[PDB]
Design an enzyme around this catalytic site. Structure first.
Site, short mmCIF file in Angstrom:
data_model
loop_
_atom_site.label_atom_id
_atom_site.label_comp_id
_atom_site.label_asym_id
_atom_site.label_seq_id
_atom_site.Cartn_x
_atom_site.Cartn_y
_atom_site.Cartn_z
N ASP A 14 -7.89 10.28 -1.88
CA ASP A 14 -7.10 9.26 -2.56
C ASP A 14 -7.97 8.25 -3.30
O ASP A 14 -7.62 7.06 -3.37
CB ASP A 14 -6.19 8.53 -1.57
CG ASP A 14 -4.99 7.90 -2.25
OD1 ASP A 14 -4.65 8.34 -3.37
OD2 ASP A 14 -4.39 6.98 -1.67
N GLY B 78 0.81 -1.20 0.00
CA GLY B 78 0.00 0.00 0.00
C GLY B 78 0.85 1.26 0.00
O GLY B 78 2.08 1.22 -0.06
N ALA B 79 0.16 2.40 0.06
CA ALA B 79 0.86 3.68 0.08
C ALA B 79 1.70 3.83 1.35
O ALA B 79 2.84 4.31 1.30
CB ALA B 79 -0.13 4.83 -0.04
N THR C 108 2.88 -2.33 3.69
CA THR C 108 2.54 -3.60 3.08
C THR C 108 1.30 -4.18 3.76
O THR C 108 1.18 -4.15 4.98
CB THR C 108 3.70 -4.59 3.18
OG1 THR C 108 4.89 -3.99 2.65
CG2 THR C 108 3.40 -5.86 2.40
#
Ligand SMILES: COc1ccc(-c2ccco2)cc1Nc1ncnc2[nH]nc(-c3ccco3)c12
Ligand SMILES: COc1ccc(-c2ccco2)cc1Nc1ncnc2[nH]nc(-c3ccco3)c12
Length: 545
Positions: A400, A287-288, A291
């Site tokens: 996002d 992910g951003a 993990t």
């Protein structure tokens, strides 16, 4: 400052309680040459450092912290302090278990924070903050004692920070941990902490991750702030001045922020789960913020294994961001938004959410590119629109929305995830000014790519980009265009091209979300309506080869 007293001045009356080292006696003190009989409390240690200790104890002066009034160097040293007629706060909340309001409890928390912030300013470590170590003169005024181990710079394990239980480091951060435990006890009206588990194992459970459960009285606002301190990293715990200013902000409207049986409160339930309750089986990717792993979760009392997705020394800023993310994710409950099952308060804060078997939508449309029907894509659009409409009602600007942040649970029902960057907006605020940072530049709007302004219309722009990505079967938007050059090519009015499957109406809906004037862009309700009308005939508005 210091009064050396003889035993002949005071006579004890009745024992009020017992401490770690000795019992406190209620007695009447007769000052030398005086007739006024001052009700004082005498503590006798079951036994010259204590002279200087009494000096530093008497040096303090604050209406929320106690001052030693005198000492007596008879066969065993004794301490004299002003008597408190209403006893300890722990016994008081136990006796008023059904007759205590939220305002009183929040005010008591404010008073404790103020007093121990004064103690921090005086640069003294309490090392023994507990509900029983809190005394009330008048119910609207509580004030701390038991400074008998203060030094110039078993044991109550249940109220001690993990570094104090294991590494025996007593700093103001451990005091903040003890303050958090004290707020927990005051919230539970004096319930035992870690009841049923003896002190020999309270270090392991803290290391494993399980913390003090959310009381029924508590909201998610106060409780998640009422944790704030139980992470292993000491610096991540909030400083006392922030605690006072925030709790005073809380004390303005205490009824909303707590629920007492007998401006909508946030009754979101956040539960703490053991690290042993679940195991990370499959890696879903990165992910951003880190993990994300997939694995089965074994809950207490139910043998059925619910497959969950877990997401993960984090920096104090990262810890605060994960705090906000956990708050936001737990506070939502919508059929098309991902919900928070719980959090694990290990050294690295772990996030526990329900697993979707097929993965994210972008990968789903990339792998199955040759088989998605028009109805699937249309229903996906309506579901994402419904999810962010519910988010808009909750005033959480997602910031996002990408094809990677929406998941496929079932082909006919999708969910939105990755709420790390979502900032809750105030009832009066209409915009949020983020201070830049590393972000997925290629997705945000002009007012966010240049002016750092994120609004509901920024989410609308992200929704338009996601729709374009979905209709393009996973093609990368703005291929070959740098991050900084997006604004240069977009300020004119040029946008992403037409997918082969979009009719004129699909693009006319898509463009309006991309208008320069944010206020002129369509609201999410009108888009929901429009795509609802499109859902009456999926084959008309798209061409499939
Ligand atoms: C945990 O309680 C203490 C711990 C330390 C002292 C202390 C500090 C210096 C001399 O004595 C004094 C107290 N307690 C007190 N000090 C004054 N008035 C009090 N009314 N009731 C109590 C009480 C009941 C149970 C525990 O304390 C008490
Ligand atoms: C960007 O995606 C996420 C971001 C955050 C979380 C999460 C976990 C705990 C709280 O939030 C969870 C997900 N995603 C997920 N949530 C449930 N099941 C999933 N299967 N596969 C994924 C996946 C692969 C790449 C990105 O997500 C995924």
């Amino acid at each position: 400052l210091l009064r050396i007293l003889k035993e002949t001045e005071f006579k004890k009356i009745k024992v009020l309680g017992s401490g770690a080292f000795g019992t406190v006696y209620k007695g009447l003190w007769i000052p030398e040459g005086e007739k006024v009989k001052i009700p004082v409390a005498i503590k006798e240690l079951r036994e010259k450092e204590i002279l200087d200790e009494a000096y530093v104890m008497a040096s303090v002066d604050n209406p929320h912290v106690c001052r030693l009034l005198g000492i007596c160097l008879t066969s065993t040293v004794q301490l004299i302090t002003q008597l408190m007629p209403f006893g300890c706060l722990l016994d008081y909340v136990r006796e008023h278990k059904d007759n205590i309001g939220s305002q009183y409890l929040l005010n008591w928390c404010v008073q404790i924070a103020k007093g121990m912030n004064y103690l921090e300013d005086r640069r003294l470590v309490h090392r023994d903050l507990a509900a029983r170590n809190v005394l009330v003169k008048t119910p609207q005024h509580v004030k701390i004692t038991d400074f008998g181990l203060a030094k110039l710079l078993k044991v109550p394990i249940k109220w001690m920070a993990l570094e104090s239980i294991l590494h025996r480091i007593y700093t103001h951060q451990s005091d903040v941990w003890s303050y958090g435990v004290t707020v927990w006890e005051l919230m539970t009206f004096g319930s035992k902490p870690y009841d049923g588990i003896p002190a020999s194992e309270i270090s392991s459970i803290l290391e494993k991750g399980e913390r003090l459960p959310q009381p029924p009285i508590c909201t998610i606002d106060v409780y998640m702030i009422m944790v704030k301190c139980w992470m292993i990293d000491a610096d991540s715990r909030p400083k006392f001045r922030e605690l006072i200013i925030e709790f005073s902000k809380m004390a303005r409207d205490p009824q909303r922020y707590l629920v007492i049986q007998g401006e909508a409160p946030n009754q979101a339930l956040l539960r703490i789960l053991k690290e042993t309750e679940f195991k990370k089986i499959k890696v879903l990717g990165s992910g951003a913020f880190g993990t994300v792993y997939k694995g089965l979760w074994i809950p207490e009392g139910e043998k059925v294994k619910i497959p969950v997705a877990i997401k993960e020394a984090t920096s104090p800023k990262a810890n605060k961001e994960i705090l906000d993310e956990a708050y936001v994710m737990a506070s939502v409950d919508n059929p098309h938004v991902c919900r928070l099952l719980g959090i694990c308060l290990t050294s690295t804060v772990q996030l526990i959410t329900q697993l979707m078997p097929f993965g994210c939508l972008l990968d789903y449309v990339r792998e199955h590119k040759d088989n998605i029907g028009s109805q699937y894509l249309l229903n996906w659009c309506v579901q994402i629109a419904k999810g962010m409409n519910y988010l808009e009602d909750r005033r959480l600007v997602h910031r996002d929305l990408a094809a990677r942040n929406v998941l496929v649970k079932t082909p006919q029902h999708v969910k939105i995830t990755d709420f790390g960057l979502a900032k809750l907006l105030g009832a009066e605020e209409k915009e949020y000014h983020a201070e830049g940072g590393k972000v997925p530049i290629k997705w945000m709007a002009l007012e966010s790519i240049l002016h750092r302004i994120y609004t509901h219309q920024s989410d609308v722009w992200s929704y338009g980009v996601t729709v374009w990505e979905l209709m393009t079967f996973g093609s990368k938007p703005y291929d070959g265009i740098p991050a900084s050059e997006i604004s240069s090519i977009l300020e004119k009015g040029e946008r992403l091209p037409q997918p082969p499957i979009c009719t004129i109406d699909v693009y006319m809906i898509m463009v309006k979300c991309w208008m320069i004037d944010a206020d002129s862009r369509p609201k999410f309700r009108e888009l929901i309506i429009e795509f609802s009308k499109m859902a009456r005939d999926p084959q008309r508005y798209l061409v499939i080869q």
